[PDB]
Amino acid sequence: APSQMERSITTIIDTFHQYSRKEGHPDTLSKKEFRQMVEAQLATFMKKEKRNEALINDIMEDLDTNQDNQLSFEECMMLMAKLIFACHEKLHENNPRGHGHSHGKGCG
Amino acid sequence: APSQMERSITTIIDTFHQYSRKEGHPDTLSKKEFRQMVEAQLATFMKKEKRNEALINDIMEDLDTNQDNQLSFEECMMLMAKLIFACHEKLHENNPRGHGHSHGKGCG
Ligand SMILES: [Ca+2]
Ligand SMILES: [Ca+2]
Ligand SMILES: [Ca+2]
Ligand SMILES: [Ca+2]
Ligand SMILES: [Zn+2]
Ligand SMILES: [Zn+2]
Ligand SMILES: [Zn+2]
Ligand SMILES: [Zn+2]
Numbered sequence: 001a002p003s004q005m006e007r008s009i010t011t012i013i014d015t016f017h018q019y020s021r022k023e024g025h026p027d028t029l030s031k032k033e034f035r036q037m038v039e040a041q042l043a044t045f046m047k048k049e050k051r052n053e054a055l056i057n058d059i060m061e062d063l064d065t066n067q068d069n070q071l072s073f074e075e076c077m078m079l080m081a082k083l084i085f086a087c088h089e090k091l092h093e094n095n096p097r098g099h100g101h102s103h104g105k106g107c108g
Numbered sequence: 109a110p111s112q113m114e115r116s117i118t119t120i121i122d123t124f125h126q127y128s129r130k131e132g133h134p135d136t137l138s139k140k141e142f143r144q145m146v147e148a149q150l151a152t153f154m155k156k157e158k159r160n161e162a163l164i165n166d167i168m169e170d171l172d173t174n175q176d177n178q179l180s181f182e183e184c185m186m187l188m189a190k191l192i193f194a195c196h197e198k199l200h201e202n203n204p205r206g207h208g209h210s211h212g213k214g215c216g
Binding site: 010045077080 | 110111113114115116117118119123135148149150151152153181182185188192193195196199200214215
């Protein structure tokens with residue numbers, strides 16, 4: 001049976017395809033598809049981005065490294081990598097040591 | 109509420125910590141912790157590695173880029189990146205177009 005780790009990897013890919021298949025090339029994200037994905041799937045991790053079209057505009061341009069106005073899977077995974085690392089760092093910030101009790105924030 | 113994508117990112121980090129916290133430094137994987145994680149969490153994605161200590165030995169040495177005999181989070185995420193890309197490619201191989209029906213293999 002698929003492990004928690006394998007399920008998580010598959011779900012990341014499935015989520016990308018849920019938005020990439022809507023219009024244009026079915027394996028790339030148009031601006032509209034990327035914004036939809038960010039607002040629906042990263043509304044907590046990218047809370048300031050969902051309500052701010054401005055930062056989404058910067059991020060699309062940063063990720064679109066071949067300047068073809070769509071995000072390939074490989075281009076979009078640069079964002080996933082940044083999010084994973086940021087979440088790891090924030091998880092540690094929210095779980096300080098030495099309090100003799102647990103914390104439950106996770107990452108934000 | 110956390111999205112499927114956010115849940116997947118958190119679960120990846122939680123799975124790393126489930127094995128990194130067992131011994132030694134609580135935020136790095138010893139050889140024993142890494143092998144345990146691979147055998148328990150990547151038994152399908154890395155099916156040939158779980159039953160083959162040999163390939164796990166190569167992978168640990170490839171990932172341990174500072175040669176300190178443990179995998180940091182950053183070092184271990186190089187493996188996660190390779191797995192995500194490999195799963196994406198295999199998902200496409202298992203879902204050929206033009207058959208007029210669905211396929212259900214996912215990635216392996
Ligand atoms: Ca598309
Ligand atoms: Ca592009
Ligand atoms: Ca450890
Ligand atoms: Ca190391
Ligand atoms: Zn794809
Ligand atoms: Zn506290
Ligand atoms: Zn950690
Ligand atoms: Zn078929």
